[PDB]
Design a binder for these strands. Structure first.
Length: 67
DNA sequence: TTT
């Protein structure tokens, strides 16, 4: 019905009292090619939090715009 | 705290 795989870890932005982390990763959803993904994760990364997926073009637009 |  839905699958995910963290293909590459890029950056951790913060971690909270319960060990969950806000991360920028490259994530493959439903076997698609990996996309940038900014999201909260459980300590062992087996539970997903709320977040956003960005295409390469969307992520490059953001990076170009703020630095 | 699930695309």
């Amino acid at each position: 019905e839905f699958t995910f795989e963290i293909e590459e870890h890029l950056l951790t932005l913060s971690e909270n009292e319960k060990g969950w982390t806000k991360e920028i990763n490259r994530v493959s959803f439903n076997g698609a090619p990996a996309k940038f993904d900014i999201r909260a994760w459980s300590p062992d990364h087996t539970k997903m939090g709320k977040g956003i997926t960005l295409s390469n073009e969307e992520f490059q637009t953001m990076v170009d715009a703020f630095k």
